[PDB]
């Protein structure tokens, strides 16, 4: 139930028709990584966490940036023991179109 970490590459401010990576990782061995967007059209994307050396990460790929993919992005993680129970939400990351 420990909050994971969320980052945006190359950054949170994106240009139109450009792809970004929203990396979600934590030292806890999270098996499922869920990214939730809050905005004009809320959505919840799923990605299986890949447990590399030390951390389990997930590279969320937000495609060609439209005004619909902009909003507040928070990240969650869960264990297959109960995919129902998510963890604490990560710190919110605001993605805005340039």
């Amino acid at each position, epitope marked *: 139930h420990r909050k994971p970490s969320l980052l945006a590459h190359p950054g949170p401010l994106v240009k139109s028709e450009e792809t970004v990576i929203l990396q979600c990782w934590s030292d806890v061995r999270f098996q499922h990584f*869920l990214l939730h967007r809050e905005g004009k*059209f809320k959505d*919840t994307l799923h990605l299986i966490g890949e447990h590399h050396d030390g951390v389990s990460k997930a590279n969320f790929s937000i495609g060609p940036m439209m005004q619909d993919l902009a909003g507040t992005y928070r990240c969650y993680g*869960s264990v297959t023991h109960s995919p*129902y129970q998510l963890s604490a939400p990560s710190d919110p990351l605001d993605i805005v179109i340039t």
Partner: antibody
Amino acid sequence: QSQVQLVQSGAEVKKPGSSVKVSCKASGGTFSFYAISWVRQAPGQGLEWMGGFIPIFGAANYAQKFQGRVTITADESTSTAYMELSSLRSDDTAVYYCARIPSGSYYYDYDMDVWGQGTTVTVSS
Amino acid sequence: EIVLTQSPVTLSLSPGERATLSCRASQSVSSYLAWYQQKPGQAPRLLIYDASNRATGIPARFSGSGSGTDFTLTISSLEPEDFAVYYCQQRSNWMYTFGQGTKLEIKR
């Protein structure tokens, strides 16, 4: 194409003004981070959405026409889903369906939709 | 609340012809649009998800298109098994409202 399969409760006959609770048991998986959507089709009519439940967010979204008489829930195991309809009217005589669909997008690892066999509920005096 | 309206009501086409179905939304759902097919006597089957992506196992003759308020389901080379009822359903903002539907019948 998903390994998950859904089985619903048997048919029911209720009187006008009573309540009915239909169950949706999942096999080969759990509702997990997906959403539970219930739909109804009356004889000759089309598909009518009743509402949905996303267990991970503890969120229940319902349709205005059923808001107030409908309740969608699930077991802590997230293996059995339930929809209870109160103030039953004859217009509620239809076949009710339960579906395991994604909360929104089917982005990346999301299995295709899985429906149940359906449940015929007849409300008549 | 967003109301999905489908056109036409009944489509009378012949085997081998190209079919076009339209789903119009009162407010934008932005590719959160699903297409279902109900053959009489059976439950609905998912055909197109996310407005344009074809479901697993669906023949390539079915195609999805549209974003926002207008959506189109194209079935080229209508195979006799395709004549049924087709519904569109929104999947935006946790609301899964259905369309009225469209009957695809055989024009003889």
